[PDB]
Amino acid sequence: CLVGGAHAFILKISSFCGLAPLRFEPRSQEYAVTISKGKCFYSYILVTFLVICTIYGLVAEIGVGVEKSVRMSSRMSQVVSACDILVVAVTAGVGVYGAPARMRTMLSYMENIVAVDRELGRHHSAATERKLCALLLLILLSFTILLVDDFCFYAMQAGKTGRQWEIVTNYAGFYFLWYIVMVLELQFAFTALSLRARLKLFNEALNVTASQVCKPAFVMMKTADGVPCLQVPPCEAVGRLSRMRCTLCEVTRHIADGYGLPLVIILMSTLLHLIVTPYFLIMEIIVSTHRLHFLVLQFLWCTTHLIRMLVVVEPCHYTMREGKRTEDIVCRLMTLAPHGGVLSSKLEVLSRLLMLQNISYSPLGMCTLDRPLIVTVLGAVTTYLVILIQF
Amino acid sequence: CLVGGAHAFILKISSFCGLAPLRFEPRSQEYAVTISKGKCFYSYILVTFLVICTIYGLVAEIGVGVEKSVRMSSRMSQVVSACDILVVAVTAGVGVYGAPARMRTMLSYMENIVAVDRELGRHHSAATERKLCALLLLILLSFTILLVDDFCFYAMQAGKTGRQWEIVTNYAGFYFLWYIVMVLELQFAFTALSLRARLKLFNEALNVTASQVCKPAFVMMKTADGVPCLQVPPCEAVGRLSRMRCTLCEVTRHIADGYGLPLVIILMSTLLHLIVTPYFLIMEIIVSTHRLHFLVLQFLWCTTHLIRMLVVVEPCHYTMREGKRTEDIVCRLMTLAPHGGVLSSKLEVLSRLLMLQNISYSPLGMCTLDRPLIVTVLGAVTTYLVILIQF
Amino acid sequence: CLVGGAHAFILKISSFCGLAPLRFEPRSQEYAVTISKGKCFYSYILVTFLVICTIYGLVAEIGVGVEKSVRMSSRMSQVVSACDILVVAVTAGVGVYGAPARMRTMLSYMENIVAVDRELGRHHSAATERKLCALLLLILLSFTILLVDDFCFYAMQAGKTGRQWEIVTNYAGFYFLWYIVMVLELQFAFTALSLRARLKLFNEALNVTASQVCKPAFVMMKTADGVPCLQVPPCEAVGRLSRMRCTLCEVTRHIADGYGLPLVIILMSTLLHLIVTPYFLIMEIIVSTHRLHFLVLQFLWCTTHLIRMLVVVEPCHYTMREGKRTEDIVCRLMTLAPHGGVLSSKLEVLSRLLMLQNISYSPLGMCTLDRPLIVTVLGAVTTYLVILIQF
Amino acid sequence: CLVGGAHAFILKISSFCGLAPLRFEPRSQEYAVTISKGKCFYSYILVTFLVICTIYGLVAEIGVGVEKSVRMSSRMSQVVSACDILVVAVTAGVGVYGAPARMRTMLSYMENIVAVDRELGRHHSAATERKLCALLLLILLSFTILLVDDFCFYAMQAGKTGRQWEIVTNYAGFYFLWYIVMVLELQFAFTALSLRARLKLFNEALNVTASQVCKPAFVMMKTADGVPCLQVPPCEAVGRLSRMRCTLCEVTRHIADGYGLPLVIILMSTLLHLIVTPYFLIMEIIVSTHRLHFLVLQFLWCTTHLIRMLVVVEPCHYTMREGKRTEDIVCRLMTLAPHGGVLSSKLEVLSRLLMLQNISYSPLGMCTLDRPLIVTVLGAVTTYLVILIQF
């Protein structure tokens, strides 16, 4: 098995988190990849250690009570902080303990994607992977910088009373589990975008099928000018592309299964944090609005909990749009195809595939990842805030 | 008519409840079954007796007022307890009074399922039925143990003032109606899972149809190694399987009709209890949090009201997934099938059946049983609790 | 044009309300029907008179203020009573002013339904029309009896202080507008059920098509035993039935257009009244619970506002179920039909009609009339009541 | 490129707003149109100037505080006024800065619509364009009159204390941004209605196809009587119309993309204003109800925020209805078409296009513009108001 681009890059990053217990073997543009049981062992230790340190750190700060426990200014603030920590520990737990089975799934289906790549002539655009690798760095580095500021702030807030080393021992684990949760979200997105790039490329082979029938080996090649061009009759190409369309839908279901449970806990904790964080921001902007550094951080957290949702639902939406574009192309193409020909009989099949096999991500069946899920989540958030804030 | 496995086992359990007024006649791996009017008569008496005892027990505890009526610490607590008892008495009532007509329906369609079993070569996996029979015992015995603890607790709470025998006379009926409601939920689930096992087995016959056309009597048999293998040409098999697909969809509609009204009252009472039970738990964890045994029981009830919902919606979701798997297989299979052949003409039919006949449970048309119903119910529960608790 | 049964009976009742400005000419089992401009003129006067009397009666009771205005015990109670009266006056207004155009539509499509009746051999079951005519009498007479009790109660409540004749002059108009709104709801239901009976009868002709192909003039006749039997080859019958299926879907869209705007205002006022009526019931059962006659009436109103919703959504749901039954029959029938025959080519067409033309009522596009609309309405009602009642 | 009617008229109006940076060249019934970079430059200046003046005007009135700041009678009233201004400045910003790319899109697809017009024989009905041009004038002039009254009122309210010139300098910019937002909404509606007129006209060519096959060059012409009549065999017409159906669906997706982001911000601000405006109306009708001129204006604003929503969702709904009418016609037409003919093979294709390519507007994928979006928005509005008003 081989992997490249920003998907291969996030797997390197995820390996240290224990989210991708893989060995990597550098080729020209790709790495060869296999499971490593030693990294699974390391990965299981790391997250278990961090969860123990996080729970006992939580117990310690509850034991300090509500006066000095900066995250826990009240009995109810203790419960909120415990649930916040709990959902992150559960999300990072499911993320890391599930990772070996998820990589076994990835290496299983990637052998079929390689066959699709050959038919499409897939080659990794350096400019495009640089865009997506820069986006990994942008999102992940920005979040890492936020975690450091949040930790430094609360440590200095306690450092004003000499208690910073205890705060470090009690919360350092929680910030590492935060990093693991974002890397898991980025690992999905750039896995899903890596498939969306192949639907997008499959649709271009189907357009050039239409242009050849409109305006008359592996399926598609570059010309001497590098433009896409078709090496086989459209009758054969549509049959070959119909098989590839089935394969891409199967890969979608493996991705949605492997990340399905993580994504549900990520969605609930997003919803939780988008209620909890604006609430205490609003309470603190009405009362003691002089704590400007706190208010800045809590705003940047509200922003981050929205981005973390978009990182999940947007890669899926962009995959839906490529499916809709296929239906548009096939409709056009089958009005062009002549009556009673072989090509139109191949397009009768493909159009049934479009009606039968949709491409979608529905984690555990609870919901469909698409932009209407944003409207659903934000409508709930504002409903609860209007209830909670108004009194 | 004959029935086996965990479905036949839950029918034995349900017979004593009067939910399955059947005689049973043991064969090698199955029971022969027919309606017994005497068990219908017994069943109608039993539930009518228990409902009378429950209503008059409710009247008695309202008559004791709010001081000593342990379930009724206030005027509003009286109304809550009356509605709790009322929905259980209605659910057990519809369950037991409807049971003879429901068994007549079961024995009507099971004669067709036997024909599907012959074509598929269905035989009951001892290991699989042991799994599902152990799951019946696990869920039902755990609930029975909870009912005993709840009853013993409140009787001892009253026994501290000598009034336990009156509590026994006033609530024993209600705990038996609770048991009847769970057995009805388990009777559905293991009826639905018994069908899902046959869709799952029908899909495997359709995969081996694809492998024979990919890599070239009743439809399917075991090899000498026990692997599935096809005794007829794929052209005949797909036609035979299309007929069986229609039969399974028809059986789904009989199950959804027979249990439809029970399931709606089960869903409302789940929603009611998931509001009422966490509310009084939260009031009692803020005030008088020393009543640790009460808080433990009320938590185990909240857990149970979630499980009772999953027992209903999960068997249906797992049945949807087998239908989606059929669409995936048929798409694959009809790209493999050659142009203009008989097989592809048989697959044109089957693909129309998939678009026309879905397999789903929609009780009384109110809703579809699937995991999105969990999100809908839990979002309402938390909306009401946020309203009720916040003031 | 001719019409019979409970549909023809409700048109007689509706004529006096001005909801069906028709002449009627009695035949053996049917009436001949044509528009009468004189009844349109009468109808426009009647509702305009009743609306004037109702508005000026409302103005009078607002002018008496909140002390003696029994419907208006507070400033807010004035606003509630005004909106209650307003939505009924608007619903009866749209009902009666729209009625001539609606009857022109009815007489337009009923000429095509007569053609469907000939093909199906439709004859009116005396026992069935007696059921539906008894249901008209049951629902309408029960409501009329409730209106009289409500009016007599409030007149006697004012009659205890001699003011009953003013109450009569100020509210008699409103009770007649209430009667007009129910007759409009019954006029829809028994129009929709009159179509559902023809889908139900069309599906039976399609089953006997299957039995003739399974077990081998106008389309269908009774045997000498009165059992349905087919007078033409199944190849012709399926073609003839496909045309009739199109005609029934067209009639559905005329009904949904003609009653669409009434039904939306009926749904909002149902939602309004299911909030307003339980609220003031709950306030009056907590405080001054001795007003037993008031509490009884307000409960019977809550019951009536639910029934008025079911009268609207249930006839539509039962029409959906007959469409689903067609899809089940066509799937079965086209697995039975032989490969490459004419019959299977006719069933390819019909199955496309089922996928393209659904049968549904969606008033003004706002919603679909089906039992999920009950869950939507009742969830809102309980959301508002939980907000309003809890403080 | 050429454009006519109320679409061409709203583009003239939009040019001064900078929403359509176009030159216009008058022909007999149409204008020739091309992008003008000078109007893009003017347009970017104008909105940037107005946004600067609006923000600094907002800063000034916040700087005057809450006593004299008539829009800002409290600290919370400051925040409300700032968000109101902010969403309008954002909506007008996206409107005007996006306008050049949107016009490039319009001139791209309008060249294909001209081809559809030739096939359909499209000519602009003077009476119909007069209706839609009068509707532009009615809606836009009525809104302009409301803006003047609102501005004159608040200036005179401040003019009673000599501060009117400062109010003019601080709010004149905001009223011009309000005008730009309505013109953008009208620019969409009359673009969408301009397409709906061509679906409506395409459906009439398909009916006359049915009548010619029922009752036996560019596709369609007027007779010597001006009735539509078909110049080609139905076999060719259905093929030609299938291609045109694809082209119209493509144009729909360009419109939805170009206006998609504006429409989402328009929907949120509609939702915001339908909460905020009735709330402060209700507070001001309970307390100080003597401010009759204020109450009148705030009611006319509530009315306007509903109309602004209908202006957006109704043109889209009317486009859905023409698609449904196509499905009705195609079903009818393909029962009429003879078995095994060429025409029925052309109708097999078109019916797949109807199942694959729907016509809809879904801005950014968040929602579908149709009348169910009204019910969704108004249910939220009343939920928040019931929460906010009740305490």
Side-chain angles (χ1 to χ4, degrees), chain D residues 130-157:
Chain D
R130 285 172 178 170
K131 183 178 179 180
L132 274 71
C133 293
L135 187 60
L136 279 170
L137 289 170
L138 177 66
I139 298 162
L140 190 58
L141 185 62
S142 180
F143 187 70
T144 290
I145 291 292
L146 180 60
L147 296 179
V148 170
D149 184 1
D150 199 65
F151 192 12
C152 293
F153 170 74
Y154 286 113
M156 289 183 72
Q157 183 179 344

Short mmCIF file of all heavy atoms in Angstrom, two decimals, chain D residues 130-157:
data_model
loop_
_atom_site.label_atom_id
_atom_site.label_comp_id
_atom_site.label_asym_id
_atom_site.label_seq_id
_atom_site.Cartn_x
_atom_site.Cartn_y
_atom_site.Cartn_z
N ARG D 130 -45.29 44.06 -17.91
CA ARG D 130 -45.93 45.17 -17.21
C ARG D 130 -46.41 44.75 -15.83
O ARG D 130 -46.31 45.53 -14.87
CB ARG D 130 -47.10 45.71 -18.04
CG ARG D 130 -46.69 46.53 -19.25
CD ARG D 130 -47.89 46.85 -20.12
NE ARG D 130 -47.54 47.68 -21.27
CZ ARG D 130 -48.35 47.93 -22.28
NH1 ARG D 130 -49.58 47.44 -22.33
NH2 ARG D 130 -47.91 48.68 -23.29
N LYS D 131 -46.95 43.54 -15.71
CA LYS D 131 -47.28 43.01 -14.38
C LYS D 131 -46.04 42.93 -13.49
O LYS D 131 -46.04 43.42 -12.36
CB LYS D 131 -47.95 41.65 -14.53
CG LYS D 131 -48.40 41.02 -13.22
CD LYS D 131 -49.10 39.69 -13.46
CE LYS D 131 -49.53 39.04 -12.16
NZ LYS D 131 -50.22 37.73 -12.39
N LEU D 132 -44.97 42.30 -13.98
CA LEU D 132 -43.77 42.13 -13.15
C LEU D 132 -43.00 43.42 -12.95
O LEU D 132 -42.42 43.63 -11.88
CB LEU D 132 -42.86 41.07 -13.76
CG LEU D 132 -43.15 39.62 -13.37
CD1 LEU D 132 -44.43 39.13 -14.03
CD2 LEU D 132 -41.98 38.70 -13.72
N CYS D 133 -42.98 44.31 -13.95
CA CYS D 133 -42.40 45.64 -13.75
C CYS D 133 -43.21 46.49 -12.78
O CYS D 133 -42.64 47.24 -11.99
CB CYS D 133 -42.25 46.35 -15.09
SG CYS D 133 -41.04 45.60 -16.21
N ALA D 134 -44.54 46.40 -12.83
CA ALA D 134 -45.37 47.06 -11.83
C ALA D 134 -45.15 46.47 -10.44
O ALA D 134 -45.23 47.20 -9.44
CB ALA D 134 -46.85 46.96 -12.21
N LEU D 135 -44.87 45.18 -10.35
CA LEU D 135 -44.56 44.55 -9.07
C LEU D 135 -43.21 44.98 -8.53
O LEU D 135 -43.06 45.18 -7.32
CB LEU D 135 -44.65 43.03 -9.23
CG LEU D 135 -44.52 42.21 -7.95
CD1 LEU D 135 -45.62 42.59 -7.00
CD2 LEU D 135 -44.59 40.74 -8.28
N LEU D 136 -42.21 45.13 -9.39
CA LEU D 136 -40.96 45.78 -8.98
C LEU D 136 -41.21 47.17 -8.42
O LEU D 136 -40.75 47.50 -7.32
CB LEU D 136 -40.02 45.89 -10.17
CG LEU D 136 -39.18 44.70 -10.60
CD1 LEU D 136 -38.54 44.99 -11.94
CD2 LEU D 136 -38.15 44.50 -9.54
N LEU D 137 -41.92 48.01 -9.17
CA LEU D 137 -42.24 49.35 -8.68
C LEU D 137 -43.06 49.32 -7.40
O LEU D 137 -42.78 50.08 -6.47
CB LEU D 137 -42.99 50.12 -9.76
CG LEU D 137 -42.14 50.54 -10.96
CD1 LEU D 137 -43.02 51.08 -12.07
CD2 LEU D 137 -41.08 51.56 -10.57
N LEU D 138 -44.06 48.44 -7.32
CA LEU D 138 -44.88 48.36 -6.12
C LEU D 138 -44.04 48.02 -4.89
O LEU D 138 -44.10 48.72 -3.87
CB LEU D 138 -45.98 47.32 -6.31
CG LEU D 138 -46.91 47.04 -5.13
CD1 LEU D 138 -47.74 48.26 -4.82
CD2 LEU D 138 -47.80 45.83 -5.37
N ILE D 139 -43.27 46.94 -4.96
CA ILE D 139 -42.50 46.50 -3.80
C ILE D 139 -41.38 47.48 -3.47
O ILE D 139 -41.19 47.86 -2.31
CB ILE D 139 -41.96 45.08 -4.03
CG1 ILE D 139 -43.10 44.09 -4.21
CG2 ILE D 139 -41.17 44.63 -2.86
CD1 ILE D 139 -42.69 42.81 -4.86
N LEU D 140 -40.63 47.90 -4.48
CA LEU D 140 -39.47 48.77 -4.24
C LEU D 140 -39.86 50.18 -3.84
O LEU D 140 -39.25 50.77 -2.94
CB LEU D 140 -38.60 48.81 -5.49
CG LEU D 140 -37.23 49.46 -5.36
CD1 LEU D 140 -36.41 48.79 -4.31
CD2 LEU D 140 -36.53 49.43 -6.67
N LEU D 141 -40.87 50.76 -4.49
CA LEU D 141 -41.32 52.10 -4.13
C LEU D 141 -41.97 52.14 -2.76
O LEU D 141 -41.75 53.09 -1.99
CB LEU D 141 -42.29 52.59 -5.20
CG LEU D 141 -42.82 54.01 -5.15
CD1 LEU D 141 -41.69 55.01 -5.28
CD2 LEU D 141 -43.83 54.19 -6.26
N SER D 142 -42.77 51.14 -2.43
CA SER D 142 -43.33 51.02 -1.09
C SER D 142 -42.26 50.95 0.00
O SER D 142 -42.40 51.59 1.05
CB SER D 142 -44.22 49.78 -1.03
OG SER D 142 -44.79 49.61 0.25
N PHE D 143 -41.20 50.19 -0.23
CA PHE D 143 -40.08 50.13 0.70
C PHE D 143 -39.33 51.45 0.80
O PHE D 143 -39.02 51.92 1.90
CB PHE D 143 -39.15 49.01 0.26
CG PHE D 143 -38.03 48.72 1.21
CD1 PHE D 143 -38.28 48.13 2.43
CD2 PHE D 143 -36.73 49.02 0.87
CE1 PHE D 143 -37.25 47.86 3.30
CE2 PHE D 143 -35.71 48.74 1.74
CZ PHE D 143 -35.97 48.16 2.94
N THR D 144 -39.03 52.07 -0.34
CA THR D 144 -38.40 53.38 -0.34
C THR D 144 -39.21 54.41 0.45
O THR D 144 -38.65 55.23 1.18
CB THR D 144 -38.20 53.84 -1.78
OG1 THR D 144 -37.19 53.04 -2.40
CG2 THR D 144 -37.80 55.29 -1.85
N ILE D 145 -40.53 54.38 0.30
CA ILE D 145 -41.41 55.26 1.06
C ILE D 145 -41.33 54.98 2.56
O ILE D 145 -41.35 55.90 3.38
CB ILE D 145 -42.85 55.13 0.53
CG1 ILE D 145 -42.96 55.71 -0.88
CG2 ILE D 145 -43.83 55.78 1.46
CD1 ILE D 145 -42.79 57.21 -0.96
N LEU D 146 -41.25 53.71 2.94
CA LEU D 146 -41.06 53.35 4.35
C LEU D 146 -39.73 53.83 4.91
O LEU D 146 -39.67 54.31 6.04
CB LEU D 146 -41.16 51.83 4.50
CG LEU D 146 -40.99 51.24 5.89
CD1 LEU D 146 -42.01 51.75 6.86
CD2 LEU D 146 -41.09 49.77 5.77
N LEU D 147 -38.65 53.70 4.14
CA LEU D 147 -37.36 54.21 4.60
C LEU D 147 -37.39 55.71 4.85
O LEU D 147 -36.84 56.19 5.84
CB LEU D 147 -36.27 53.88 3.57
CG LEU D 147 -35.94 52.43 3.31
CD1 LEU D 147 -34.89 52.38 2.27
CD2 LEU D 147 -35.46 51.73 4.54
N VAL D 148 -38.02 56.46 3.95
CA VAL D 148 -38.13 57.90 4.13
C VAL D 148 -38.92 58.25 5.39
O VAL D 148 -38.49 59.09 6.19
CB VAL D 148 -38.75 58.54 2.88
CG1 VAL D 148 -39.11 59.99 3.11
CG2 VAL D 148 -37.80 58.41 1.70
N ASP D 149 -40.06 57.59 5.60
CA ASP D 149 -40.83 57.85 6.81
C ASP D 149 -40.05 57.53 8.08
O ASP D 149 -40.03 58.31 9.03
CB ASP D 149 -42.13 57.05 6.78
CG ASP D 149 -43.03 57.35 7.96
OD1 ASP D 149 -42.66 58.19 8.80
OD2 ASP D 149 -44.11 56.73 8.05
N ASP D 150 -39.40 56.36 8.12
CA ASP D 150 -38.58 56.00 9.27
C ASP D 150 -37.49 57.04 9.53
O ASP D 150 -37.29 57.47 10.67
CB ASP D 150 -37.98 54.61 9.05
CG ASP D 150 -37.52 53.97 10.33
OD1 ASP D 150 -38.38 53.68 11.19
OD2 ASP D 150 -36.31 53.73 10.48
N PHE D 151 -36.78 57.44 8.48
CA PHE D 151 -35.72 58.44 8.63
C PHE D 151 -36.28 59.80 9.05
O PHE D 151 -35.74 60.44 9.97
CB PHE D 151 -34.98 58.58 7.30
CG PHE D 151 -33.70 59.36 7.38
CD1 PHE D 151 -33.13 59.70 8.59
CD2 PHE D 151 -33.09 59.78 6.22
CE1 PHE D 151 -31.96 60.42 8.63
CE2 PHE D 151 -31.93 60.50 6.25
CZ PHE D 151 -31.36 60.83 7.46
N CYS D 152 -37.34 60.26 8.40
CA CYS D 152 -37.96 61.52 8.78
C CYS D 152 -38.47 61.50 10.22
O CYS D 152 -38.32 62.48 10.95
CB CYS D 152 -39.10 61.86 7.82
SG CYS D 152 -38.57 62.23 6.13
N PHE D 153 -39.07 60.39 10.64
CA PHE D 153 -39.54 60.26 12.01
C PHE D 153 -38.41 60.42 13.03
O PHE D 153 -38.47 61.27 13.92
CB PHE D 153 -40.23 58.91 12.20
CG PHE D 153 -40.53 58.59 13.63
CD1 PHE D 153 -41.55 59.23 14.29
CD2 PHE D 153 -39.80 57.62 14.30
CE1 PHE D 153 -41.83 58.93 15.61
CE2 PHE D 153 -40.08 57.32 15.61
CZ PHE D 153 -41.09 57.97 16.26
N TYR D 154 -37.36 59.61 12.91
CA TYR D 154 -36.27 59.68 13.88
C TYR D 154 -35.51 60.99 13.81
O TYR D 154 -35.03 61.49 14.83
CB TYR D 154 -35.31 58.52 13.68
CG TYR D 154 -35.82 57.18 14.15
CD1 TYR D 154 -36.10 56.17 13.25
CD2 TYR D 154 -36.05 56.94 15.50
CE1 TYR D 154 -36.58 54.95 13.67
CE2 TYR D 154 -36.55 55.73 15.92
CZ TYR D 154 -36.81 54.74 15.01
OH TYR D 154 -37.27 53.51 15.41
N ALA D 155 -35.38 61.57 12.62
CA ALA D 155 -34.77 62.90 12.51
C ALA D 155 -35.62 63.97 13.18
O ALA D 155 -35.09 64.85 13.86
CB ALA D 155 -34.53 63.25 11.04
N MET D 156 -36.94 63.91 13.01
CA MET D 156 -37.82 64.84 13.71
C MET D 156 -37.86 64.57 15.20
O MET D 156 -37.92 65.51 16.01
CB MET D 156 -39.23 64.78 13.12
CG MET D 156 -39.36 65.37 11.73
SD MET D 156 -41.06 65.35 11.13
CE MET D 156 -41.80 66.62 12.15
N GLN D 157 -37.83 63.30 15.60
CA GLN D 157 -37.75 62.98 17.02
C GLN D 157 -36.51 63.61 17.65
O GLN D 157 -36.57 64.14 18.77
CB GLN D 157 -37.76 61.46 17.20
CG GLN D 157 -37.74 60.99 18.64
CD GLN D 157 -37.78 59.48 18.76
OE1 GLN D 157 -38.11 58.78 17.81
NE2 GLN D 157 -37.46 58.97 19.94
#
